[PDB]
Amino acid sequence: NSNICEVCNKWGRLFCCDTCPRSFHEHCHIPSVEANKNPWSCIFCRIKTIQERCPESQSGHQESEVLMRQMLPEEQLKCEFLLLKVYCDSKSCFFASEPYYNREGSQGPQKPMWLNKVKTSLNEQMYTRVEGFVQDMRLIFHNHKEFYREDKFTRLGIQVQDIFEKNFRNIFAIQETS
Ligand SMILES: [Zn+2]
Ligand SMILES: [Zn+2]
Numbered sequence: 001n002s003n004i005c006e007v008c009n010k011w012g013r014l015f016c017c018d019t020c021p022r023s024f025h026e027h028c029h030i031p032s033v034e035a036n037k038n039p040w041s042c043i044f045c046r047i048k049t050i051q052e053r054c055p056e057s058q059s060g061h062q063e064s065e066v067l068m069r070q071m072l073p074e075e076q077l078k079c080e081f082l083l084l085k086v087y088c089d090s091k092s093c094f095f096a097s098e099p100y101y102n103r104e105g106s107q108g109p110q111k112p113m114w115l116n117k118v119k120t121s122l123n124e125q126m127y128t129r130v131e132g133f134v135q136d137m138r139l140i141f142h143n144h145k146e147f148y149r150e151d152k153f154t155r156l157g158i159q160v161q162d163i164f165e166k167n168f169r170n171i172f173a174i175q176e177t178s
C-alpha cells in the first residue's frame with residue numbers, strides 16, 4: 001500500500017485499502033474510515049464495483065436526469081466520491097472551511113457555502129436528490145467569483161470548479177458533447 005494519504009498526500013495514521021494500494025487518513029476518506037470491517041474497501045474500489053456490476057451505467061446521461069435522481073445508496077456514494085475528488089486537489093483548502101467577507105467594494109454572498117458544510121450535510125443525509133448536493137457545490141465557486149470580482153484570486157474558484165465539473169461528468173457518466 002501507499003505510505004501517503006491519497007487525498008492530502010501526507011503521511012500519518014493511515015488506513016489501508018484491502019483491494020487496492022491506496023491509503024487514507026481517517027477523516028480524509030469520505031465517508032470517514034469505518035471502525036471495524038476486515039477486509040475494508042475504499043471509495044475508489046466501491047465505485048469501481050458499481051461500474052463493473054452494471055457496465056451500462058457508463059453509457060451517456062443527460063445532466064437534467066442525473067440531478068433529479070433520489071439520493072439512494074449508490075447516488076449517495078457517488079456524491080461522496082465526487083466531494084472527495086475535490087478535496088484531493090490542494091486548492092480545495094481555500095473552500096474547505098467557513099469563509100468570511102470584508103473587502104472594500106464587495107458585499108458577501110447571501111448564502112455562504114463551503115466544503116466541510118457539504119461534507120456534514122452528506123453525512124447527515126440532508127440531501128434528498130443529487131441536485132441538492134450539486135447546487136451547494138456550484139454555489140461555493142459562484143459565491144467566490146462574485147465576491148472577488150476582478151481580483152486575480154477569482155481564478156482559484158474557476159480552477160476548483162473545473163475539477164468539480166470534470167469529475168461530475170466522469171462519475172455520473174454525463175453524455176460527452178462539444
Ligand atoms: Zn489525508
Ligand atoms: Zn481501494
Ligand SMILES: [Zn+2]
Pocket residue numbers: 053054055056
Ligand atoms: Zn446492469
